[PDB]
């Protein structure tokens, strides 16, 4: 149990533990990857907002690289 839907990233990638555990933290990145990718193409017109959202994407996608790097 213990969900993985509660906690944070956790910040350092190398400090995470056995491979069956970081697998679920990894998909705990990919959903927000999926969610905010759908939030890219929206015609909602806020160009300043989608710029900071674009930076958050690039941040999370770099994390997704790092979780794959640890594995």
């Amino acid at each position: 149990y213990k969900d993985y839907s509660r906690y944070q990233r956790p910040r350092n990638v190398s400090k995470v533990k056995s491979i069956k555990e970081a697998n679920e933290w990894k998909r705990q990145v990919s959903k927000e990857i999926k969610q905010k990718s759908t939030r890219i193409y929206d015609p909602s017109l806020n160009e300043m907002q989608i710029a900071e959202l674009n930076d958050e994407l690039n941040n999370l996608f770099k994390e997704w690289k790092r979780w794959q790097w640890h594995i």
Binding site: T38, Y41, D42, S44
Partner: protein, 98 residues
């Protein structure tokens, strides 16, 4: 004039919370739809095909109207023999889908 600019805007806004919120939810729903469609197009640019997800059922017997003729009230059987005419609609309707 600022009182008059407030009065000019209040007299020309007639809806309330429920209609304005319904407008906002309708614009945001279409914005979600436009985003999801262009996703499938950009994935189709890569050659990888991803189907559109159906809307989730709210209740148990929710109807997929797209799936079938909804409540098919067929016309009453007449005498004038619509046999060639059904062949030409089907040929035209299959032509339209092609």
């Amino acid at each position: 004039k600022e009182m008059l600019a407030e009065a000019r805007a209040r007299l020309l806004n007639t809806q309330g919370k429920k209609a304005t919120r319904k407008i906002r939810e309708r614009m945001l729903e279409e914005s979600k739809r436009i985003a999801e469609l262009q996703k499938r197009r950009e994935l189709k640019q890569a050659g990888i095909n991803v189907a559109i997800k159906k809307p989730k059922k709210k209740y148990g017997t929710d109807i997929d109207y797209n799936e079938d003729i909804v409540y098919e009230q067929a016309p009453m059987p007449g005498i004038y023999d619509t046999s060639t005419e059904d062949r030409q609609i089907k040929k035209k309707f299959e032509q339209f889908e092609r």
